[model samples]
Target: MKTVIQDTADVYFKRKSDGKLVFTAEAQTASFSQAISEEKLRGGIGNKPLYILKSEKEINLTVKNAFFDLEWLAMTQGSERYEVEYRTIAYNPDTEEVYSDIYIQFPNVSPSGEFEMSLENGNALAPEIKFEALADTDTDEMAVVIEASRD
Candidate 1:
């Protein structure tokens, strides 16, 4: 099998607990990032291996062109906290494989707007949204798992 990414992946999202579509936006230019933290310890001992400490994995995503739920964004006079259940499905036409990502509850979903839109003498512009993964007691899963398969 070969690693791949296709165009215009399927994107959907919903309210965290209810598990129902609330504000599913057309996600464009989605970016996923994962990293790990580490610490190096040095001692006064000779011919000794330096101790290294590694932190848990960190995952986050950046989405573009999302309509940005007004309510969730605190722009509409409502609850300030919003947990998102986001997902994405990308297909590889070359191999007939599928790549699906199910993003769990994101406590921090920052929506930023660059420029205002104009109807008459202007072009359309979209804002970018960022989702930071949070730790949950149940699974402690901060990110989505991508599966690839062919049948």
Candidate 2:
């Protein structure tokens, strides 16, 4: 039986001044401020650093997080060779506490620009990928797995 994993996240990507690919959840100050103001009344929420990935086509993902296991699969083709980076954000609504983790996945193997993960705006050569928590599994520890591969 295949379990239906219900999760979603916001992804972003942009090109650096040096022409290198840069991905993150945090956008420009204007964009961040606007988003926070529209989302919350109190405002003043700061943007957090996030792991970003560049793709030629928008990626489809299935993320599973449980009591002892976390896994993610990126539904894209031609991604057998590419870089993978990720971060984790943990939050407790009851206590209003939050934390984050930033890191990169080793042993990346995929094509340079054949993956179908596309950026938000098509202007940039590389698009940034981001993820947001949709539903939290009732567990002490949260785990995540993200896979980008050719279909």
Candidate 3:
């Protein structure tokens, strides 16, 4: 009946202060990237590095959705009350399983720090939200991934 179809992914964010769910929406695309810096040290070797030092890992994620709400706007602000835990869940029809990811804002990372939105006359308006995912100071964890599930 239709030439194009798109599935939906559920997204949720919980306020870190009281652990209450704050934001929920559907995402069309989700992706992430990681980066690390390395330093090579040379000793008494020629053209060979004797030591390699690596810096802490850095992570960045972007999610696009055809939606936004008051909580989403509030959380995007730089405020202690806006700090939140983010999670996204999706069902894959091919695998017949549900998968999800949980991200806790690092002590130095703000939730939805980078957000972009553009409006047009004949197009749907969707906001693209990007933020850094750093290792948690308390647990040293970058993020949590839930294995694919049949539930």
Candidate 4:
């Protein structure tokens, strides 16, 4: 089937459980061209470990299926000199709980005023799949998974 991508900063992919062609992101690079290449390679890699930067105290969301999972991976740290950070949040729908793992990749990180949201559900074996991310704040741009299909 043809792949479709929405403008909500989210990307989708068809399933191939054989593992021969799994999705992956590009490595971070210093050069502008290299960085763009890495960004393209990373594509849907954002789906697995949802990343977020918390500049404020709170963000809200609404998810369906309630059977999946979530996790957070930290990418940077904020301090007196810097004000940026990165982290990942993993949620398990079965238990209705979330697990967060944070790591700081850069020091003196300044908030980039950027955020991403994503959801994954119903693999190749399942029928009909949909993912959505909703937040309480009006200014935050939320990434959303519009739809997925397999044959």
Report the number of the highest-lDDT candidate.
Answer: 3
Instruction: TM-score for candidate 2, please give it.
Output: 0.24
Q: Per-residue alpha-carbon lDDT of model 1 for 71-94, expressed as tens digits?
A: 645744552333555555555677
Compose the digit string of candidate 3's lDDT tens values, residues 1-151. 6698656555554445565454446545566567877556446567776666546566766656544555646676644433334444555678856564434443334555533344456565545666566444475555655543444
> Which pairs of residues have clashing backbones in candidate 3?
none
What TM-score would each prediction reach against the true structure?
0.50, 0.24, 0.52, 0.18
Give the Cα-based TM-score of candidate 3 against the true structure: 0.52
In candidate 1, where is summed lDDT lowest over 10 consecutive residues?
Answer: 108-117
Q: How many backbone clashes does candidate 1 have?
A: 0
TM-score winner, 1 or 2:
1
lDDT of 2 by residue, 1-151 (tens): 6987443233222222332232344222211111111222333345753533321122222222211112222222211222324444444567655443333232222212335665567563323322322222454212245443221
lDDT of 4 by residue, 1-151 (tens): 5898321111112222321211112112211111111222334465675764433332222112222222211223211322112223444566755453322122222222224333386444321222222233446343322222211
Candidate 3: 10-residue stretch with minimal lDDT: 100-109
lDDT value, residue 133 of candidate 2: 23
After superposition on all CA atoms, how large is the RMSD of candidate 3?
A: 5.9
